[PDB]
Amino acid sequence: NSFSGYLKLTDNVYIKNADIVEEAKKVKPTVVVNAANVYLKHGGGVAGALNKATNNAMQVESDDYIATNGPLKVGGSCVLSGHNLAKHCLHVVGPNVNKGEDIQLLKSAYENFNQHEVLLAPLLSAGIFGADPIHSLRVCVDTVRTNVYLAVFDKNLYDKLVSSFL
């Protein structure tokens, strides 16, 4: 397929040092995953980058979703438009360690991926959500059964994830 340059970690998990926005623009996947919060407020991190790439269309759509349905749950998800990046965006809420949220909900968050055959995704609960990215990758491998292409922005983190993988 159109995913190029990934390292194979397992039967179904692949990883690349890449900006998820640029990779979505190049591949136009069926599903891109957003690292969302429960309010779908896309201010920073991956969410802020994806929203900016849609010229704020993602935020306008999200505000309507919240007005109609209320907040997500931690560990939950919703499927919205992918705008100019993808057919669909799967907004998944991993726990935010900095808010005291239970890291065990990371497994629930990754289970949402199993409803989709192929996904382009970031590591959940990494970055500004405060969890250890090595732990996030382990939970991903052990939970997701569908095909997941992981994009890791930071080269030093990418190298550490690959070189410590077991």
Side-chain angles (χ1 to χ4, degrees), residues 95-143:
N96 185 329
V97 175
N98 298 314
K99 288 175 202 175
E101 297 173 346
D102 182 354
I103 188 73
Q104 300 177 93
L105 298 167
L106 186 56
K107 191 168 183 79
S108 304
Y110 277 117
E111 285 168 344
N112 294 287
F113 289 24
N114 289 323
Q115 297 299 312
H116 301 280
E117 296 104 298
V118 179
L119 310 92
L120 172 64
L123 286 173
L124 300 177
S125 294
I128 67 173
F129 283 66
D132 168 27
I134 293 166
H135 176 68
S136 183
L137 179 59
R138 180 81 254 151
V139 178
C140 181
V141 165
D142 290 342
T143 305

Side-chain angles (χ1 to χ4, degrees), residues 48 50 52 115 128 140 156 162:
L50 285 177
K52 178 177 178 189
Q115 297 299 312
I128 67 173
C140 181
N156 295 308
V162 169

Side-chain angles (χ1 to χ4, degrees), residues 7-98:
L7 177 69
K8 186 170 177 63
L9 295 178
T10 66
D11 285 346
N12 64 303
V13 181
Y14 292 78
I15 193 165
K16 182 177 183 182
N17 173 47
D19 180 334
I20 191 169
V21 175
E22 289 309 309
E23 187 75 4
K25 288 202 271 175
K26 155 197 310 222
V27 174
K28 288 142 181 193
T30 300
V31 179
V32 66
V33 176
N34 184 32
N37 57 53
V38 294
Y39 302 113
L40 302 178
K41 295 320 142 219
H42 308 302
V46 166
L50 285 177
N51 176 56
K52 178 177 178 189
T54 75
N55 196 27
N56 212 50
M58 179 180 285
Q59 189 67 68
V60 171
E61 181 193 30
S62 291
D63 288 349
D64 172 79
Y65 175 94
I66 297 291
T68 297
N69 301 109
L72 299 175
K73 295 181 186 140
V74 180
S77 70
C78 66
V79 179
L80 294 173
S81 178
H83 300 282
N84 57 322
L85 301 175
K87 184 181 199 252
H88 305 283
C89 181
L90 181 66
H91 295 271
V92 180
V93 184
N96 185 329
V97 175
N98 298 314

